[PDB]
């Protein structure tokens, strides 16, 4: 099942793209994007984003250095995520604070959220999905191929495995779409 969601992210060779520009809209309203993106005020404000969501806040390499200080005066509301892009980092720890943050968002009619990472291809999708799959009613199989048809995604096995985790609860619950 894990094997489905990456048959969808890929062609089928085994290989796997990687996003062709640094950012994407990727359903009306939401961005996926990479650091040089979120780092960059200027272009943010000109493409109307108010919030940012940073799930790779850290120090790394594979983390990108910023906070609610970096955009504070640019009236751009922040939050961080320190997730690391493993197979046993437990994003799924904070999908409903994600979704929340996506929420408070598109509540606003000018809103426009950001959510990225370091490449905007592992963690920062898995938030997105997860968001629509727990507040759009979508299964992971909709939402996943929605968000890969506008951006070249690929959550790691460890976060398709928490993403079809939530798409059995939420089926379970009876919570998803028809």
């Known amino acids: 099942s894990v094997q489905d969601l990456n048959d969808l992210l890929s062609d089928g060779s085994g290989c796997y793209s990687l996003p062709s520009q640094p950012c994407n809209e990727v359903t009306p309203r939401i961005y996926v994007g990479n650091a040089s993106v979120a780092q960059d005020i200027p272009k943010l404000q000109k493409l109307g984003i108010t919030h940012v969501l940073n799930a790779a806040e850290g120090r790394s390499f594979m983390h990108v250095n910023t ?13 961080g995520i320190k997730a690391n892009d493993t197979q046993e980092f437990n994003l799924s720890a904070y999908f409903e ?15 426009r959220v950001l959510v990225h990472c370091r490449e905007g291809y592992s963690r920062s999708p898995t938030l997105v999905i997860a968001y629509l799959m727990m507040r759009q009613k979508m299964d992971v ?30 089926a379970k619950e009876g919570k998803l779409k028809p």
């Open 67 to 79: 906070n609610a200080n970096f955009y504070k005066d640019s009236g751009i509301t922040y939050l």
């Open 97 to 111: 604070r994600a979704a929340d943050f996506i929420d408070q968002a598109l509540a606003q009619k000018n809103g």
């Open 141 to 170: 199989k909709s939402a996943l191929s929605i968000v890969r048809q506008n951006r070249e995604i690929g959550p790691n096995d460890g976060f398709l495995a928490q993403l079809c985790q939530l798409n059995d609860r939420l």
